[PDB]
């Protein structure tokens, strides 16, 4: 029942490796990591791969852990109305034109954050249109499938399964094992 | 009395080489070229080494050939009042901050044009302050010594001789042999 220490020091066993491989095969991607807490995953991801010269466009109904993780990095944040795509496209165009505040230099990077299924409304995310917009304007995509994975789709694969979207157009996928798997952790 | 053709085809003799070496040694620089007309020199230089994403700050009393050469390239142009240095520094700072028009991207290059001696006023150019500003803000300098070379300085070397400025802080020097040498051409 006991672990040694962090993963990078002594904490890795073969069970972790098997779990990572099996998750990566299940989702449809090439590789994956597993953590011991979902809140921590969201809180410490954007810190690692973002900065204060990049912009984040997040939905207005996103979970608290995404907001904490984005806040701890430094990037500029703008929000768009829930389930409104013309506004999203308008905002993308305007923010590309304007540039960084106080300098108007080009944005170094733009990331769009969303959720598979918003669990206070019961609605979905317009994944096809999000993929179209990200391919047209060269943005990036991040999807949080906490309530979607395991419980939706013909075979239980999530929103990519639902919309027939190829799980390769989405740059980063994350989820948790807490909801529909009867366990703890994240990936 | 006849020449073959252009310099790049058959037109070069050893006399041209001797003249170029002797001019370069006289001025104090490392190399030089000689042309058959001064107006043409000014008209066809900036075309070669500039573009439409660069800015030029020229004095308001500059000769017509400089204006034609700058016009034929495409670069943005701004002028400052004659013999006013606080205005020049203010303009430099403002134009660095603002950036390109309609895009506000950084200026790719900034060039400052001036004349050794303005031959309608009889005044000089504040060369020390120009060198200070170009070294402080990382601009470039271009000096047109048509009336200065040969006729001013303790030994006839121009405005660099007059102000004791080292003829290395000035990126490009040009002049003519028409005024004080009793000949035709430019360098």
């Amino acid at each position: 029942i006991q672990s040694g220490g962090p993963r990078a020091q002594i904490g890795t066993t073969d069970l972790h490796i098997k779990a990572e491989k099996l998750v990566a095969r299940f989702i449809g991607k090439e590789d994956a990591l597993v953590f011991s807490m979902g809140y921590g995953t969201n809180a410490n991801l954007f810190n690692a791969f973002l900065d204060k010269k990049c912009l984040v466009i997040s939905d207005e109904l996103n979970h608290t852990s995404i907001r904490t993780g984005v806040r701890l990095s430094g990037a500029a944040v703008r929000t768009f109305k829930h389930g409104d795509m013309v506004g999203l496209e308008k905002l993308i165009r305007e923010q590309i034109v304007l540039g960084q505040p106080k300098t108007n230099r080009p944005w170094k990077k733009i990331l769009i954050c969303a959720e598979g299924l918003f669990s206070m409304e019961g609605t979905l995310c317009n994944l096809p249109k999000l993929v179209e917009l990200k391919k047209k304007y060269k943005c990036y995509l991040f999807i949080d499938e906490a309530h979607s994975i395991g419980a939706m789709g013909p075979t239980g694969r999530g929103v990519c399964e639902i919309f027939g979207v190829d799980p390769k157009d989405v740059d980063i996928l994350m989820g948790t094992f807490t909801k529909s798997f009867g366990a703890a952790g994240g990936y």
Side-chain angles (χ1 to χ4, degrees), chain A residues 3-187:
Chain A
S3 50
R7 290 288 300 275
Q9 166 178 319
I10 202 169
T12 309
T13 53
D14 50 354
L15 205 51
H16 293 79
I17 301 299
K18 191 212 289 189
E20 293 185 9
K21 283 182 169 66
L22 188 153
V23 165
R25 198 174 76 242
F26 180 94
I27 293 290
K29 285 282 202 166
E30 307 186 12
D31 221 345
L33 283 77
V34 297
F35 312 107
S36 50
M37 191 205 208
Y39 190 92
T41 295
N42 268 314
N44 298 293
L45 176 73
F46 313 83
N47 170 357
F49 80 89
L50 277 185
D51 211 336
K52 71 182 293 294
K53 292 200 179 180
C54 316
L55 185 147
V56 174
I57 304 176
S58 71
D59 191 336
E60 76 171 12
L61 283 188
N62 272 356
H63 191 248
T64 303
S65 60
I66 298 176
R67 275 148 34 190
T68 291
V70 170
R71 194 150 81 96
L72 191 149
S73 50
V77 188
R78 315 261 170 240
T79 53
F80 61 95
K81 184 178 184 293
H82 182 231
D84 187 356
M85 292 279 135
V86 296
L88 174 48
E89 193 186 1
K90 186 189 328 301
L91 197 152
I92 288 186
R93 292 155 62 84
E94 155 195 335
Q95 289 302 323
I96 290 181
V97 166
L98 262 54
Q100 308 194 17
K102 181 266 299 189
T103 314
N104 275 43
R105 279 205 174 200
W107 281 120
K108 171 149 53 181
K109 212 180 304 181
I110 287 185
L111 177 56
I112 310 177
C113 293
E115 277 192 26
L117 178 138
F118 299 90
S119 66
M120 281 266 157
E121 299 272 328
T123 54
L124 283 158
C125 74
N126 213 319
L127 196 50
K129 191 146 290 300
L130 289 183
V131 176
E132 301 185 10
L133 286 178
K134 79 165 269 285
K135 285 212 301 288
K136 178 179 190 173
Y137 291 96
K138 315 146 204 160
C139 299
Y140 293 109
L141 209 60
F142 167 91
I143 298 297
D144 186 11
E145 272 166 290
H147 295 257
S148 297
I149 193 66
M152 310 206 97
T155 50
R157 259 61 175 179
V159 287
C160 285
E161 193 84 329
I162 291 183
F163 291 113
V165 179
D166 176 39
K168 177 175 101 183
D169 291 331
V170 180
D171 290 293
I172 296 171
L173 290 164
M174 74 92 62
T176 64
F177 305 119
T178 287
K179 267 76 175 182
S180 54
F181 294 111
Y187 70 81

